[PDB]
Design a protein around this ligand. Structure first.
Ligand SMILES: Nc1nc2c(ncn2[C@@H]2O[C@H](COP(=O)(O)OP(=O)(O)O)[C@@H](O)[C@H]2O)c(=O)[nH]1
Ligand SMILES: [Mg+2]
Length: 162
């Protein structure tokens, strides 16, 4: 049956990379991203509309602590569907290098922001684990690929683990 999929990762970890590919390859999947959907109230609505059509839904947000993820777990329970999770394991170094690549942040005294931003997220980042009392069915950790782009095989490999 259909299921809700939580992406969890630092800025620049590759969450959009992955979720975009998934929805491209699989038409029974939809993607909730705030850069495309705006407010959270709006994201919740879309999420509800997709579950109403028994579609799978993937949540492209840092989802950096229990509170952030609950929103979606809560909606999933509403439609009696499970919630799995994909944690991107890319480290502060990797993300930092990716964020510099984009060169769209102020830079100089008071630091290069974006590295700052990353640092702020890092300090509030609580990924799901065995112990957190959240009601997630399965947590899979995903390591970075050599390739900047996400292969169909990579998507398949992830989905194959529930
Ligand atoms: N090598 C490698 N680069 C990746 C991977 N995932 C994403 N990237 C790159 O990292 C950058 C940030 O990815 P993006 O999806 O925007 O990150 P998000 O901010 O977590 O949604 C982009 O340049 C991607 O090409 C991965 O698995 N491996
Ligand atoms: Mg993104």
């Amino acid at each position: 049956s259909n299921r809700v999929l939580l992406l969890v990762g630092l800025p620049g970890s590759g969450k959009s990379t992955f979720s975009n590919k998934l929805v491209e390859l699989k038409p029974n999947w939809r993607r909730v991203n705030q850069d495309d959907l705006g407010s959270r109230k709006n994201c919740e609505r879309h999420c509800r509309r997709f579950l109403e059509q028994q579609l799978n839904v993937v949540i492209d947000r840092c989802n950096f602590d229990e509170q952030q993820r609950s929103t979606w777990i809560r909606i999933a329970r509403e439609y009696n569907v499970p919630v799995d999770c994909v944690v991107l394991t890319a480290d502060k170094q990797t993300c930092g290098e990716r964020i510099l690549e984009r060169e769209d942040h102020p830079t100089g005294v008071q630091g290069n922001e974006g590295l700052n931003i990353l640092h702020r997220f890092v300090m509030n980042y609580i990924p799901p684990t065995y112990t957190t009392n959240e009601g997630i069915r399965r947590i899979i950790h995903l390591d970075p690929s050599p390739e900047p782009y996400c292969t169909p095989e990579r998507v398949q490999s992830v989905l194959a683990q529930l």
